Design a protein around this ligand. Structure first.
Ligand SMILES: [Cl-]
Lengths: 228, 222, 230, 224
């Protein structure tokens, strides 16, 4: 009982629990690391992909440690620590600007009722920038070589996707056109934007699930499979 | 001397330009004068002593051939060259292949004025039965969704900018000297971007320090 | 106060204790992992580089887990988990062929007294290939895309360096010539061969946990070799 | 059709070849006939329908220019090109710039016979006061220790082989179609390597190697 393989395959996996997520504060570009539970989340994701027989040619991550660490753990489980890995800031979560580090109570104080509803249901609401005196995650040395004009300071989800999309088109798509299997360890908002883009959707997945996109040699999407 | 240097150079006369039709992505090649324009551009850069670590071009032949000629004059045929569609001229859609009179018949008085003076007017897409330059096999591996069909200058820059930021800026931050052989609209958009805002045969020279501050913009000519 | 910096810098680290090392068997390409102590060796090496202020533009490892895992830990300590990393089989330890997995007693049985002395003091003695029925580490799926003719089966140290040298020249030197700071997490024999090549030492002429620092000018002249330790 | 394809082409007439002197790394350029050789070679590949994913050349101008002309004929000027010194012709050292008569004066009777019949004779290095082609600024970023000065054909292949294994084989394993514009000695060494020959084609022919997904050589076709 064997199944015919696709020409190319894209697997998108979400990173596990970060310390900010556990403390219920917004992180965005704040470089919060995995908790012990988040490390176990990464081991579980690696075992999920191994049980489906995935062998990847390349793995992508954001510049954020919770994504990079998840990638390393997953590749460790898959016995693929040797494969090419690529990290880039354009796969980063939204930069939340002023909202960086806020909890639920501070969000409700900062946003009007109407703004909060748009913030939850839509993708177009842009947070304001980091305040004077607020530690801004993008002042990190890891960003020292980027064009300063391009560094975001308060991003809606739409704006995040406008700067992630060129990276997806210029780095991930060409590898899929070569017939490769590509893994991406990703933030939730980025994963959902990529899913919407590929399926051509218009404007909620169980924790620990992965998305499997299968393509033919003309980059037609043949199937989207959820594995868990 | 500066920490890094970017030289931008425009390609020379194309056959469409000589016949006074609009090309956009239409893959028109250099005329005899366009070839001599490239040799003269090479001699201008050689007289200023430029030695480049890398050269960029668009996916369009008039840009690629100019790069090859320039590098030949500079005795740098061996350096790395990179061509990419994101540096292409605007895709003119319906206006592709039209001459000046056809542009007026197709565009109203207001549309033609904004098309001439501004950057925001988007031409309509190619008509049915019109040869679309993006159907070229050289674009067969691009994400089908990203291929344009009718672009304003603003739209062209929105897809060229990520390439400039991701391929050009990192090399300048490494201290390299970078050459770009570009189309007029792309060169003007890059200049406007870098300066936070030219006579034929001229070249733009951008000098940067190690924080990527623009120290000077020099126009060199013969 | 401050010292004038070199144009480019190459730091070479050795990986820490592997399980084969703890059990006193030769590994070579056998993909033995770090022990708990080897993991702590990697954290300590990271702290060493952190106290000397190193910020690398790129890090290289072999295809062997014990080297890759050491690289990951060191970059974690350095807060450089985002930097580019490159792994390649040409930085692998010698493929020990038949000697793979042997302990001291089996080595002494297999080699003559003359052969053993040359084995310890020289770099030219080549082991035989893996025997029939012996598990060969190169049959690992991670090597499936290599040219089958290039895969070694029993290497002397000289032979190891003959296939590592082109990688050093084609991938590390060009980045040093760009002015970059390069980290290599290496195997002991590979580190020693690189040191010999760079210093122009003869075949005639570091404590555990030490690192080698090579400093170069823009013509790739070796300006200094510094040994650093805690 | 095969999983992957390698085409190797030799560059056309250089000025040194026309003058019957040995160039090696001497950076002699194509003649007007040599440029026509490149156009002819391009038309040969076009008539067989080749569409390449990438093209390789040496750092020598006669190889680079041939690559550019061939890609012009193929309507593939946009494809990725890679040039590298490891695909260079032998560095002839002292023999650089010499003609047939001078090589007789320099080499003994035995040495000249080894030079013509075998691949193992290493020429001596460039003489004092002899302009060395490796002093070219295009080589300024190489490890100075690696630069040759007098290379037998065997030595040339020892430094070209790792480039073939590390750059060309992985792309053939990816299922790509690869073009190499090469020098005769380099082309012959690659052919011997791929066919496993032990240690005679028209000037304008091309070699076509067809492979399956395990990198088994299914067939070698000569087109002219
Ligand atoms: Cl050596």
């Amino acid at each position: 009982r064997k199944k015919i393989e696709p020409f190319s395959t894209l697997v998108i996996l979400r990173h596990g629990e970060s310390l900010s997520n556990l403390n219920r504060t917004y992180s965005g570009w704040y470089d919060t690391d995995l908790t012990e539970k988040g490390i176990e989340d990464a081991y579980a994701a690696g075992r999920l992909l191994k049980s489906h027989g995935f062998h990847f040619d390349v793995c992508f991550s954001s510049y954020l440690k919770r994504s990079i660490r998840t990638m390393w753990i997953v590749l460790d489980v898959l016995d693929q620590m040797h494969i090419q890995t690529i990290s880039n800031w354009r796969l980063n979560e939204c930069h939340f600007g002023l909202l960086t580090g806020m909890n639920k109570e501070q969000i409700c104080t900062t946003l009007t009722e109407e703004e909060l509803n748009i913030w939850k249901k839509d993708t177009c609401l842009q947070p304001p920038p980091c305040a004077p005196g607020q530690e801004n995650p993008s002042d990190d040395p890891k960003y020292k070589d980027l064009d300063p004009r391009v560094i975001p300071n308060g991003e809606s989800i739409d704006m995040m996707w406008e700067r992630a999309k060129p990276y997806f088109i210029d780095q991930i798509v060409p590898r899929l056109m070569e017939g490769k299997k590509v893994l991406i360890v990703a933030h939730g908002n980025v994963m959902r934007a990529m899913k919407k883009y590929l399926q051509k959707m218009t404007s909620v997945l169980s924790n620990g699930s992965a998305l499997v996109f299968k393509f033919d040699n003309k980059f037609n999407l043949l199937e989207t499979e959820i594995i868990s």
